[PDB]
Design a protein around this ligand. Structure first.
Ligand SMILES: NC(=O)C1=CN([C@@H]2O[C@H](COP(=O)(O)OP(=O)(O)OC[C@H]3O[C@@H](n4cnc5c(N)ncnc54)[C@H](OP(=O)(O)O)[C@@H]3O)[C@@H](O)[C@H]2O)C=CC1
Ligand SMILES: CCc1nc(N)nc(N)c1-c1ccc(Cl)cc1
Length: 219
């Protein structure tokens, strides 16, 4: 009251909950990159192609948007919602180097002067409940923290986590989630719905990874 649009988290973290060094993701796992793209891009049902009339949204902090290599700004086929206390939509667009692509990106980027909560209230609007199918929170550290506590955590439907091993020695930013069998002080307990068997990445270092899905426990 007002309600918050339900959402899912997509993240890649190691055993220490490390997700980044403050500016970028330390490891290179191309299989996770591809999976992230498909998971956040894919729409429900058969043969539904993303468009302004219906697509998914990815919500991220301004630093995560900046971490995006300019050539991938904005994330294609998805509404990009950037949280920033100052950066305007125009200022976000100005960071897109290809001027033609920038002209096209005008309808794919939205700047929110607020946190995840503000984004979730906005994504409930008559204009987004129909045009936005699924809302994915994609980072970073500060946004994940907001995602895991009230009032956001209350509408959290799932966490698509890519488990990375071995632990990185460059992570200073984390994704703090209660271990299996534990419930956070606020009351959040996560249950593993599924997890792939460990696989070795073709990227540098050959990091081992698993695609795991977690959902809040609903006794
Ligand atoms: N492994 C993974 O899956 C992921 C890793 N990352 C990594 O994490 C790091 C970035 O994390 P982090 O430092 O926490 O930065 P964030 O991505 O979380 O962005 C923080 C910023 O977002 C905006 N913001 C956050 N809360 C609010 C609010 N309540 N109101 C208005 N604006 C808000 C502000 O930007 P502003 O300064 O403009 O005001 C703030 O500085 C990088 O190392 C990146 O590579 C990021 C996503 C996923
Ligand atoms: C492909 C990396 C990746 N993998 C997973 N599992 N989750 C994420 N949230 C991201 C990610 C991090 C930063 C940006 Cl800028 C875009 C996406």
């Amino acid at each position: 009251r007002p309600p918050l649009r339900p959402f899912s988290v997509v993240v890649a973290s190691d055993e220490k909950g490390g997700i980044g060094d403050g500016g970028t993701i330390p490891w290179e796992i191309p299989e996770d990159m591809q999976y992230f793209r498909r998971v956040t891009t894919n729409l429900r049902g058969k043969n539904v192609k993303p468009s302004p009339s219906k697509r998914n949204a990815v919500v991220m902090g301004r630093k995560t948007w900046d971490s995006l290599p300019p050539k991938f700004r904005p994330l294609s086929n998805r509404l990009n919602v950037v949280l920033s206390r100052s950066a305007t939509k125009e200022q976000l667009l100005a960071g897109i180097p290809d001027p033609i692509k920038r002209a096209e990106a005008a309808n794919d980027v939205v700047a929110v002067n607020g946190g995840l909560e503000d984004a979730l209230r906005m994504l409930v609007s008559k204009e987004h409940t129909s045009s936005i199918e699924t809302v994915f929170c994609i980072g970073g550290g500060t946004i994940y923290k907001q995602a895991l506590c009230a009032p956001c955590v209350n509408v959290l439907q799932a966490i698509h986590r890519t488990v990375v091993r071995p632990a990185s020695n460059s992570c200073s930013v984390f994704f703090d989630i209660p271990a299996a069998g534990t419930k956070t002080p606020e009351g959040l307990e996560l249950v593993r719905e599924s997890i792939t068997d460990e696989r070795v990445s073709t990227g540098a270092g050959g990091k081992k990874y698993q695609f795991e899905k977690l959902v809040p426990r609903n006794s």
